[PDB]
Design a protein around this ligand. Structure first.
Ligand SMILES: Nc1nc2c(ncn2[C@@H]2O[C@H](COP(=O)(O)OP(=O)(O)O)[C@@H](O)[C@H]2O)c(=O)[nH]1
Ligand SMILES: Nc1nc2c(ncn2[C@@H]2O[C@H](COP(=O)(O)OP(=O)(O)O)[C@@H](O)[C@H]2O)c(=O)[nH]1
Lengths: 370, 218, 369, 369
């Protein structure tokens, strides 16, 4: 069960290469895509070694790197181009699907703010649901005329992408100043790659459960509407030490309210006996609020750090506070609507996202059902 | 040989030292969780109004010393001790309006003085002598006697065996004032009770058998 | 010393060999009987100077006019520790005793879980039907195809796993089993008895791994069906019935990867061989207890959640439209039984159930039931 | 349940470092934060080893010490600079507070004599804002200076959960009397001894007093009277110690009566003679208490650091502390009529007048109302 990855837009093509140079480094893979001498299951991302990538000016910058053998700005303008290269790119996609044994999902890296992303990323999600109906489409989208590109795209991600992880540049640029002291794009991307890498740790190493993308998402998303997640990377030592740093909003890249379900990923060699002791004290302290309506639990998983390269940690959070970020955007959208062929598609898009923010604000009530 | 392997380890002596240590630090965190039930919930807490029967596992080489009817007495003093830690901690965790504070010091003192008496003057006096005695054990039998002469005396100094409804109940009923006053956070009707039961306590204990005077000052 | 027994009349007290107690001598303790059977099986399965010295010691005992039990063990305990030390070398250093144990944890204890989800995906239709005399080999080619399907290639240790089907003495999964042909040196430690209790665990762990998989497929079926008012009642029960199994499937890495962490420690500390024979025997005994298998009530309650969920996931997959022709009339039957079983297990919980209840009630939802 | 330390200004960073020197000297922890081989529960004051220290020009001096492995002059000036780095420092607190399993208290070492007094004023109002269930104890140090001092009092009068006075003048007296010095680097040698011995019952577990709230709330009768003074005579039975403690030559403070006395005994004394010593203290009556509330004297036994002789410490709540306030108070009225709103200074003068007027009434037979 392999996952074909697609990368669109400048931001998407840039983070992917930094995600690729990170992944092949964790394994014994030379930049020439050849194994070096120097158990780790490597089939999920590599084909027999070539990564199952489809990259879509910046391409020249990639081929000039020593990793060469590894393989306008308006929403309307980006879409029009898509329909014109409709047939051209799908043969690239289709041939990769038939080549794989049992294709499972579609990882996509794109930015709503990015024009090409706001035009070409949006078009694929409708076509991907049309051609292949039984394939999950999960995207590592990243939030930043600017509000327009954002809200118009959110209209597609709420009905096409059955999963999504948001990465806000505002909080990322903030974290860069306080604990990294940078002031560029070339520095903040270093931490972005760390998130995507540890996000797919349990899949690349043989474990007991979590052997597919479905094995991670299904516990998080209960309903087709509540399909937005958040990440948190603490190390920038026991099992109880790492969790107390996760729940602090000082490290989560975000700018009543309660979670839905938590997934914890530990990449260290900690003694797995005291993890049940850590959870007990957490329930005693009551550090995070939950939903009363439905049964939920806090989960944790273990794995092994790359030996060829100490405890790290990544958390997957499903919080209703993420709705506020939408409101801020849609608020600015209404601000530009009253100041400036049909101008109607942008009207229905504002209405459908109203349901999403409504669903989350109604989710934090004891009567979210019906 | 048995006594030899009992200092550590069939170290019977080493096992005995741990016994009176895991009750009578560590047990502070254990009870504090109970302040804020289930029978399995406690176990994971431990492994981390008057019930909580506690037991232990003893190997055959020391089974003859720490008998079965010996566990209950060790359990008896543990139950009563917690109720003292309870009232002591309940009136401590918090921090005619200010008139309540005068009822605090007038009370937080009294329970505190009693706690200073049971633990230090009794649960540490005989304990210091008992260790100095067992280290000179020279017999299978007399080791039982020096031990049995440690419980049956510590159950007497700590008044729990007899004269319960005559003396012990007084400390018990005034302990209910530590519960009632803790929740509320009628006021005049408390000192009328408090100044009565406390005077009832001294005017009853005044009969002092002699070691009771170490607390009779207050 | 040579891996064969010279008996033709049921004389010796050793008859996959076993041990006999109703014919065992009186003064000889059962402990040393466990030592003997291990050293013999470990050589039979195995098929320099450590040979002649053991012979003369055995002969010297025959000249003693008094059989002293304190001396009988004095020579056997060296032989046990002798073959165990060399076997531990082969099990770890050349074969990555420790190396064999790692292979066991993988295939018996579902350590390589990714292999068994693709194995189920292929060997699914050829097992739901009642098993017959041909499905025994019809699946072995699927399992062999599965190991090559995840680019795990080794001509060693692959032909040592031969799936068996208990036929003629019912679904196919109820009779599935996995046997392992032990080598000679490890035969003293791996009797058909200890390999039997391993086999029982493999059936129960494979069952819950099967129901979670097909259940996750139902999750992908609701998500696929994004655009009926009663259509929401599925996921309101599916996601409900998902947490009862997923969390049941947790605590397993917290009981396997923890107990296994102790057994792997007990060997690298003690130089004695008797410690291995008792620690490993103690290690397996916990799996029967901690995994809630021996305790009938917890074993009889969650047992109903398994086959109840089968009907549910099949019902939603057996149609392509909404549950209209008595389908919704059928869904309302299980929820009347399942939701009661949810509170029923809540009463069973209220030694180790805290490690299970802590995860189940960290969100304090079952407090409302 | 742990306690986090914070060192402010040149003074606070000086007194804390030397206290961390001796504390690491008492414990079996080498200067390089690595355990030495050579019974003590140290999780409260150490993290696995790095101290839970929050230091705030002298930073260079701390780094230059071989212990590098162990991690204007206006009050309004400090207040402004604190808001500037509000989130700058509180992230360090929050990463450690949430980084601590169960935080218990907040100890503060600061001098109200320039910027640390202003920054310290900022922390108190801020710490009460966010953390409502966290103890705040301040080991403030006493001696244009009257202004900075009186403001910190106004903040300390209602924010801090407790307070321990340490006046330099009385400390200056001990510097010459029993040491014959006339130095800053020498007076703190006693301050560290005062600090280390104060929390000995928490670092070496005993039967009583296993939490800091267990020690203080026995003294403080009401949250207004939350000011304490200490005593340390040893520079011999249990009776010899306490009598040496009540002599005003040793009290670190430059009608009247006590409120409650808590004593620390760290020697190898016998618990057979302590209850009789209290009697001779009462019969001979070397001290008086409040006439309203029945006051008691407490004393605790402890264990001296084996890695390091009978010593002892005394904590007191004495109403004679009112005189110390009245001096700076008089000094304020002195410069007020002697020389953008200048109105907050009057608000501080009003509240500190209340506390003093309560002291004088606290020692009367009619403290009620
Ligand atoms: N995180 C991240 N975001 C990026 C990067 N490069 C561009 N972006 C985002 O892309 C947006 C600009 O889009 P742009 O690149 O002009 O779109 P294009 O002209 O269609 O490529 C900005 O708001 C950025 O937040 C990157 O390297 N990392
Ligand atoms: N007793 C004592 N007092 C000190 C020490 N260091 C500084 N002080 C006092 O602290 C006051 C000056 O504090 P200051 O350095 O201005 O603090 P800052 O403004 O925050 O840097 C002086 O009045 C000193 O009496 C010390 O080591 N011992």
């Amino acid at each position: 069960r392999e996952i074909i990855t697609l990368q669109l837009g400048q931001c998407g093509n840039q983070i992917g290469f930094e995600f690729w140079k990170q992944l092949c480094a964790e394994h014994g893979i030379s930049p020439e895509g050849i194994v070096e001498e120097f158990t780790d299951r490597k089939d999920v991302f590599f084909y027999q070694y070539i990564p199952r990538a489809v990259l879509l000016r910046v391409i020249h910058s990639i081929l000039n790197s020593p990793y060469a053998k590894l393989y306008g700005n308006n929403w309307a303008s980006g879409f029009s181009q898509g329909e014109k290269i409709h047939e051209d790119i799908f043969d690239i996609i289709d041939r990769e699907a038939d080549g794989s044994d049992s294709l499972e999902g579609f990882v996509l890296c794109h930015s709503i703010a990015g024009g090409t992303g706001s035009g070409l990323g949006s078009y694929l999600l409708e076509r991907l649901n049309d051609r292949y109906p039984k394939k999950l489409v999960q995207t590592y989208s990243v939030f930043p005329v600017q509000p327009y590109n954002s809200l118009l795209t959110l209209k597609r991600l709420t009905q096409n992408a059955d999963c999504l992880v948001v990465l806000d540049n505002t909080a990322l640029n903030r974290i860069a100043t306080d604990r990294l002291h940078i002031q560029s794009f070339s520095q903040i991307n270093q931490l972005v790659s760390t998130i995507m890498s540890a996000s797919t740790t349990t899949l690349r190493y043989p474990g007991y459960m979590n052997n597919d993308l479905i094995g991670l998402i299904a516990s998080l998303i209960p309903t087709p509407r509540l399909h937005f997640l958040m990440t948190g990377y603490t190390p920038l030592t026991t099992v109880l030490d790492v969790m107390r740093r996760l729940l602090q909003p000082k490290n989560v890249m975000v700018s009543n309210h309660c979670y839905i379900a938590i997934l914890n990923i530990i990449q260290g060699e900690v003694d797995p006996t005291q993890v049940h002791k850590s959870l007990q004290r957490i329930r005693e302290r009551k550090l995070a609020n939950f939903i009363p309506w439905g049964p939920a639990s806090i989960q944790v998983a273990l794995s092994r750090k790359s030996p060829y390269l100490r405890v790290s940690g990544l958390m997957m959070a499903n919080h209703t506070s993420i709705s506020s970020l939408f409101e801020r955007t849609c608020r600015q959208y209404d601000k530009l609507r009253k100041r400036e062929d049909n101008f109607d598609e942008m009207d229905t898009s504002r209405e459908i996202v109203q349901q999403l923010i409504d669903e989350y604000h109604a989710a934090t009530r004891p009567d979210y059902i019906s | 040989n048995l006594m030899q392997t009992l200092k550590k380890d069939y170290r019977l002596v080493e096992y005995l030292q741990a016994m009176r240590n895991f009750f009578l630090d560590t047990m502070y965190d254990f009870y504090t969780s109970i302040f804020d039930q289930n029978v399995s919930f406690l176990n994971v807490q431990l492994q981390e109004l008057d019930g909580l029967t506690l037991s232990y596992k003893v190997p055959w080489p020391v089974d003859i010393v720490i008998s079965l009817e010996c566990q209950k007495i060790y359990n008896q003093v543990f139950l009563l001790l917690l109720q003292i830690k309870w009232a002591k901690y309940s009136l401590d965790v918090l921090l005619q309006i200010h008139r309540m504070f005068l009822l605090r010091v007038k009370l937080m003192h009294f329970v505190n003085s009693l706690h200073n008496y049971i633990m230090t003057r009794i649960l540490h006096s005989t304990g210091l002598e008992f260790q100095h005695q067992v280290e000179e054990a020279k017999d299978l039998d007399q080791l039982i006697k020096i031990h049995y002469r440690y419980l049956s005396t510590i159950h007497d100094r700590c008044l729990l065996r007899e004269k319960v409804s005559f003396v012990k109940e007084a400390i018990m009923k005034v302990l209910n004032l530590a519960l009632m006053f803790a929740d509320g956070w009628s006021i005049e009707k408390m000192e009328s009770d408090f100044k009565n039961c406390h005077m009832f306590l001294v005017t009853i204990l005044n009969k002092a058998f002699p070691h009771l005077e170490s607390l009779a000052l207050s | 010393l040579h891996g064969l027994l010279l008996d033709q009349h049921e004389e010796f007290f050793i008859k996959q060999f076993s041990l006999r107690v109703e014919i065992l001598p009186s003064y000889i303790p059962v402990r040393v009987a466990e030592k003997i059977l291990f050293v013999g099986e470990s050589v039979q399965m195995f098929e320099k100077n450590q040979e002649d010295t053991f012979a003369a010691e055995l002969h010297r005992l025959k000249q003693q006019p008094l059989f002293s039990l304190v001396d009988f063990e004095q020579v056997v305990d060296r032989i046990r520790s002798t073959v165990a030390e060399h076997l531990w070398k082969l099990m770890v250093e050349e074969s990555d005793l420790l190396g064999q144990l790692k292979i066991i944890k993988d295939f018996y204890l579902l350590g390589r879980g990714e292999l068994f989800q693709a194995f189920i995906d292929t060997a699914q239709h050829m097992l739901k039907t009642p098993p017959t005399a041909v499905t025994e080999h019809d699946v072995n080619v699927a399992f062999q195809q599965s190991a090559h399907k995840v680019l795990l290639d080794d001509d060693n240790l692959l032909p040592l796993l031969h799936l068996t089907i208990e036929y003629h003495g019912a679904s196919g999964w109820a009779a599935l089993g996995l046997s392992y042909k032990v080598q000679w040196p490890l035969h003293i430690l791996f009797t058909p008895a200890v390999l039997e209790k391993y086999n029982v665990v493999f059936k129960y762990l494979l069952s819950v791994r099967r129901v979670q998989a097909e259940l996750q497929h139902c999750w992908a079926l609701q998500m696929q069906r994004k655009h009926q008012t009663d259509a929401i009642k599925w996921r309101l029960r599916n996601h409900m019935a998902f947490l009862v199994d997923n969390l049941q499937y947790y605590l397993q890495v917290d009981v396997l990867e923890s107990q296994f962490s102790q057994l792997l420690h007990q060997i690298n500390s003690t130089r004695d061989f008797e410690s291995i024979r008792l620690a490993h025997d103690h290690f397996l005994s916990n799996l029967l207890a901690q995994s809630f298998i021996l305790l009938k009530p917890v074993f009889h309650c969650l047992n109903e959640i398994l086959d109840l969920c089968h009907s549910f996931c099949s019902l939603v997959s057996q149609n392509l439209g909404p549950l209209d022709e008595r389908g919704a009339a059928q869904l309302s039957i299980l929820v009347k039984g399942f939701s009661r079983q949810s509170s029923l297990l809540f009463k069973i919980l209220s030694n180790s159930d805290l490690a299970q209840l802590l995860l189940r009630l960290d969100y304090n939802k079952y407090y409302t039931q």
